[PDB]
């Protein structure tokens, strides 16, 4: 299947003071593999999967040096944004930054990402063509213009289509048994009598990997977000994921309803019905 | 712009020295290079952003700090044993982008302050042989015996600096190659027409500005203290 | 990342055209050209970004290769004033510029009426304490260094008497030594057959 590598950076001011919090994490697909936490004692990039543990000292020193450069960059940025929006010093604010690359089944580049949020809303994002920027407002337009005069986008596109993609392939192979496994969901169906002429039908998917999955309910019949509640896909904590979808049904008619499960672990989709 | 001071620096081996590099161009990223004669640039240290620096290709024996956006000081320690160089600072709006360089600092490191001598300066009058054959007339200036090679030579005619018809040696000659701190010589030519030269009211001076010892360098020797100073020699046109 | 410049030195005649190269095995997202005179900071000439794009200044023409892996610098009717060291540089992935090692260009004048000659000049205060002036020779004449260690001899340099269109080459030789005279000063040099030695 397709694979991806992503990096997530969170920077939070804490004025009073003092120092802002900087947290960076790294993922290949749905498996975390590195971290940096400004508040930990080490002050180093640190491993979070068994297969990244084989990298040499120069990798770890390399990553640490670079993540510290990132961190001081977002230190300035927090100051700057405080100015672009005229906000005082007493308030706590947040920058989030995400970047990475998608490959398809052939492991050649497919897509690249490079975007920022301020206080939980989009700020500026490199577009899918890796050539132009979406600046969501007037402060973000100062950034866009600054980045255009200095040909920032061209250097990012070279990274994302090149180096980003070579690191992902290396990683996919370091951790072949981890990262390249698929885990078909274990499925079942509960039926709770909630009300007297009404019933809950609940479709479960357990122990699956990757996280991506589609759970739909049909009556007869066809799709219905006409009284289907979902939950966010959640980590089991062993490296697998869980999900459920529910419908409320008029009691005596469970028979009309079928749950439909799509994964990559499934050769073809599952259809489940309720069993007496 | 970018500035760095001073133009010429001179130190004794074993001393640390810090070179100044300032810019009000509003640039995030700063750089230091050394350059040896007839060579390219070698990167010592850079700084992509305030409060962060990282080593270049040729970092051993150097340090830097970046506490303020505007300034990137470079310290030459008892490093390795090749601190004599032309040092150039540059900046750019963001790391990896186009860089603007400063005017450069020339740093010489001596084995002993006793090795400093000012130039002697002489003017050689045009050969009559040249005058009648070519109707032109070349004067030569030789400035000899100076260390360090930190000098500026100029020609002056009736109290006014001249650039036309002047040619100065790009590099000096070493008066003795086997000596680690050999003194130098340098020549220059000034060519005028015969009729200009032969006017007994036209005045020729060759000037060498020399960069030497400072008024807090210690002098004990019998010769005069070889301070920063100007040496000259002159001539008058000849009544033929 | 590597940027390779070639040639290291190029010597040509005034009025001639010339190209120089900066080559890489990898893409470069932006690239720069500089020109340095000795004892001065490199002057930034151009930045290029788009593969295939062409830019001009005075007599210089720069081109970025299509695949963004090389660049050329062209000079059309070069002049003595184009003399200088020329450097290329590109965006480095570690937050620096990657520099080529440079190209040293000399543009030499074309001498109208060469008149090779060696003149003795006398001191103004030590009347005859002397230098030997080799002057007015064509630009294909090289001056060799001293075969003797108390004979001092300079490289050739061009002087331009601006208001007569007259360029000339010269070199100077001098000594303390007993047997020095101007007849033998430039013995170790290949000197024009018809070089004038005033008697």
């Amino acid at each position: 299947g397709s694979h991806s590598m992503r990096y997530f950076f969170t920077s939070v001011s804490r004025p009073g003071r003092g120092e802002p919090r900087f947290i960076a994490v790294g993922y290949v697909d749905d498996t975390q593999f590195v971290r940096f936490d400004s508040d930990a004692a080490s002050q180093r990039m640190e491993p979070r999967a068994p297969w990244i543990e084989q990298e040499g000292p120069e990798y770890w020193d390399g990553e640490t040096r670079k993540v510290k450069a990132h961190s001081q960059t977002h230190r300035v940025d927090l100051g700057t944004l405080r100015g672009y929006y005229n906000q005082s010093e007493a308030g706590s604010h947040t920058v989030q930054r995400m970047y990475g690359c998608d490959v398809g089944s052939d492991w050649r580049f497919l897509r690249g990402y490079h975007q920022y949020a301020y206080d939980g809303k989009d700020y500026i994002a490199l577009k899918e063509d890796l050539r132009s920027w979406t600046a969501a407002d007037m402060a973000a337009q100062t950034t866009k213009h600054k980045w255009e005069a200095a040909h920032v986008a061209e250097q990012l596109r070279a990274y994302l289509e090149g180096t980003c993609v070579e690191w992902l392939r290396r990683y996919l192979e370091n951790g072949k048994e981890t990262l390249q496994r698929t885990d078909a969901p274990k499925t079942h169906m509960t039926h709770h009598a909630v009300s007297d002429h009404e019933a809950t039908l609940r479709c479960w998917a357990l122990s699956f990997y990757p996280a991506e999955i589609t759970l739909t309910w049909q009556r007869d019949g066809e799709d219905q977000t006409q009284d289907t509640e979902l939950v966010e896909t959640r980590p089991a904590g062993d490296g697998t994921f869980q999900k459920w979808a529910a419908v409320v049904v008029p009691s005596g008619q469970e028979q009309r309803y079928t749950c439909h499960v799509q994964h990559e672990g499934l050769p073809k989709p599952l259809t489940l019905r309720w069993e007496p | 712009g970018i500035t760095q001071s001073p133009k010429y620096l001179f130190r004794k081996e074993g001393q640390n020295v810090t070179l100044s590099c300032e810019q009000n161009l509003n640039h995030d990223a700063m750089y230091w290079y050394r350059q040896d004669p007839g060579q390219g640039l070698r990167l010592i240290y850079y700084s992509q952003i305030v409060n962060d620096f990282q080593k270049g290709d040729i970092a051993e024996g150097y340090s830097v700090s970046r506490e303020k956006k505007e300034s990137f000081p470079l310290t030459v320690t008892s490093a390795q044993k090749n601190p004599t160089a032309f040092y150039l600072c540059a900046s750019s709006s963001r790391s990896s982008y186009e860089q603007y360089f400063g005017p450069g600092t020339r740093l010489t490191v001596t084995e002993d302050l006793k090795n400093v001598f000012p130039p002697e300066v002489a003017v050689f009058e045009p050969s009559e042989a040249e005058i009648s054959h070519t109707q032109k007339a070349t004067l030569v200036c030789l400035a000899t015996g100076f260390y360090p090679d930190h000098v500026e030579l100029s020609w002056w005619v009736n109290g006014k600096e001249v650039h036309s018809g002047v040619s100065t040696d790009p590099q000096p000659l070493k008066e003795q190659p086997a000596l680690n701190d050999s003194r130098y010589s340098l020549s220059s030519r000034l060519r005028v027409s015969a009729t200009f030269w032969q006017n007994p009211r036209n005045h020729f001076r060759c000037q060498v500005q020399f960069y030497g010892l400072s008024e807090n360098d210690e002098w004990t020797q019998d010769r005069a203290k070889p301070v920063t100073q100007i040496v000259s020699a002159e001539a008058w046109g000849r009544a033929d | 990342q590597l940027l390779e410049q070639s040639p290291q030195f190029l010597s040509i005649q005034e009025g001639e055209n010339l190209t120089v190269y900066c080559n890489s095995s990898s893409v470069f997202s932006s690239l720069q050209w500089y020109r340095q005179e000795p004892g001065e900071g490199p002057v930034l000439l151009v930045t290029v970004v788009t593969g295939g794009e062409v830019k001009k200044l005075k007599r210089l023409t720069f081109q970025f290769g299509d695949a963004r892996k090389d660049s050329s610098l062209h000079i059309t009717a070069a002049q003595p004033g184009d003399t200088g060291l020329y450097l290329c540089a590109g965006a480095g992935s570690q937050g620096n510029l990657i520099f080529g090692k440079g190209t040293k260009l000399s543009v030499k004048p074309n001498i109208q009426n060469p008149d090779p000659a060696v003149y003795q000049l006398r001191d103004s205060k030590s009347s005859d304490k002397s230098v030997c002036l080799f002057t007015d020779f064509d630009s294909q004449t090289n001056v060799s260094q001293s075969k003797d260690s108390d004979v001092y001899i300079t490289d050739k340099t061009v002087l331009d008497m601006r208001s007569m269109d007259f360029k000339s080459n010269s070199a100077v030789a001098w000594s303390n030594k007993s047997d020095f005279a101007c007849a033998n000063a430039f013995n170790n040099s290949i000197i024009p057959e018809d070089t004038f030695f005033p008697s």
Binding site: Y7, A24, G26, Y59, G62, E63, K66, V67, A69, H70, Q72, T73, V76, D77, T80, L81, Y99, Y116, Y123, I124, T143, K146, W147, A150, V152, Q155, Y159, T163, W167 | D28, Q48, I49, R94, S95, S96 | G92, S93, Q94, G95
Partner: peptide, 9 residues
């Protein structure tokens, strides 16, 4: 691996 060049907003 992460980016070796940084730039301010």
């Amino acid at each position: 691996g992460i980016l070796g060049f940084v730039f301010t907003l």
